[PDB]
Amino acid sequence: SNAMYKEGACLYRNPLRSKSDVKDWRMEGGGQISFDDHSLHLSHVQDEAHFVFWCPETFPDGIIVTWDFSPIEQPGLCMLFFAAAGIRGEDLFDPSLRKRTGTYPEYHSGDINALHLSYFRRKYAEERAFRTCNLRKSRGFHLAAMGADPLPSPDDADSPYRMKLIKDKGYVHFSINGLPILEWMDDGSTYGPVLTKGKIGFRQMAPMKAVYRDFAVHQAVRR
């Protein structure tokens, strides 16, 4: 449990402080972008305008992903997509893939594969009644792991929170403020081959309002 990993060379770092920082990012769905206080504010144009906002860079396998997160207003839900690519290995933005509009089934039951970890799952009463973070693997919407979510409701927040995700072949580990939340080891024969490289994206279920800062990707060094 909690195998030792160190961050290696920095592969990518985005402060997310101004519009120029998300210049080539791809917004799928009705997300609203703002940079008040020199930080990325993500909201929605309508109450059910769910979306996925993608970083355009293809990241390799064996990485540690970090970012600052601040839950500002609920109801809502957040989710990080990673190791995302076409089912045949196509670039997530290759024109040959079906168009996506932020509608969930397009991501878990479409023509792409990806790991997706939901946190601050507070969109529905059932979710707010038992707070957890869930890790799924698609295509297939397969539940891989879950753990309790220490994130409070906005009223009691002491933002931002330090999010850290490790992805190294079959291994996935997630922590918040250094506290391990969940971990998983894909054997590669239960829910298909192990996912490797791919895009990273930020999803929100409306009417979520959140702030993101200092998104970085480092090489994962296994000790």
Side-chain angles (χ1 to χ4, degrees):
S1 179
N2 302 309
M4 253 261 90
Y5 274 87
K6 289 303 186 189
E7 290 180 50
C10 182
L11 304 180
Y12 178 86
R13 181 180 283 286
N14 191 324
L16 295 176
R17 299 184 66 262
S18 70
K19 304 174 184 180
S20 59
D21 289 323
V22 298
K23 175 184 179 300
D24 290 299
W25 283 42
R26 293 204 181 186
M27 174 63 78
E28 303 179 343
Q32 194 168 180
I33 297 169
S34 162
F35 285 88
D36 189 304
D37 292 300
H38 293 286
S39 58
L40 174 65
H41 287 248
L42 289 182
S43 57
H44 305 261
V45 299
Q46 289 195 43
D47 278 353
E48 304 309 317
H50 313 316
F51 71 73
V52 181
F53 189 41
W54 303 94
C55 168
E57 307 293 334
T58 294
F59 298 102
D61 195 351
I63 54 172
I64 296 182
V65 184
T66 55
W67 72 100
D68 276 19
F69 173 73
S70 303
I72 304 303
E73 203 174 68
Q74 69 182 205
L77 174 151
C78 294
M79 182 188 299
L80 190 86
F81 275 90
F82 54 112
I87 293 180
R88 296 184 180 182
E90 309 98 313
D91 180 81
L92 202 68
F93 306 119
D94 187 300
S96 69
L97 303 177
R98 293 198 284 285
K99 298 166 67 174
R100 298 182 299 265
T101 63
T103 312
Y104 207 26
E106 307 172 323
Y107 303 85
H108 63 63
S109 301
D111 60 10
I112 65 171
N113 284 323
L115 285 165
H116 33 134
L117 205 171
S118 53
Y119 59 95
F120 195 78
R121 308 177 65 250
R122 319 293 166 80
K123 169 64 179 183
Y124 302 111
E126 282 186 291
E127 304 177 331
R128 294 192 292 278
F130 195 68
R131 305 169 187 185
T132 67
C133 294
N134 301 1
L135 174 71
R136 286 188 187 275
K137 183 189 186 184
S138 293
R139 190 176 198 285
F141 193 63
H142 305 295
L143 182 62
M146 72 170 258
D149 185 358
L151 291 171
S153 33
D155 57 353
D156 295 334
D158 177 27
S159 301
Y161 292 86
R162 282 285 175 74
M163 325 291 79
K164 182 178 290 183
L165 179 74
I166 298 173
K167 169 65 179 65
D168 183 15
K169 292 191 177 62
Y171 187 66
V172 177
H173 183 282
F174 181 54
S175 66
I176 295 173
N177 281 13
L179 178 70
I181 299 301
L182 63 75
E183 80 174 12
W184 178 61
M185 179 63 82
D186 189 351
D187 59 25
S189 66
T190 299
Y191 299 134
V194 168
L195 299 186
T196 59
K197 61 182 179 182
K199 314 291 189 185
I200 292 175
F202 293 79
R203 171 177 185 65
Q204 290 194 354
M205 282 192 84
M208 184 77 215
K209 287 197 175 182
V211 177
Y212 306 76
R213 272 260 215 165
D214 306 326
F215 168 47
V217 182
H218 290 258
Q219 281 285 315
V221 178
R222 183 175 54 152
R223 285 295 180 71

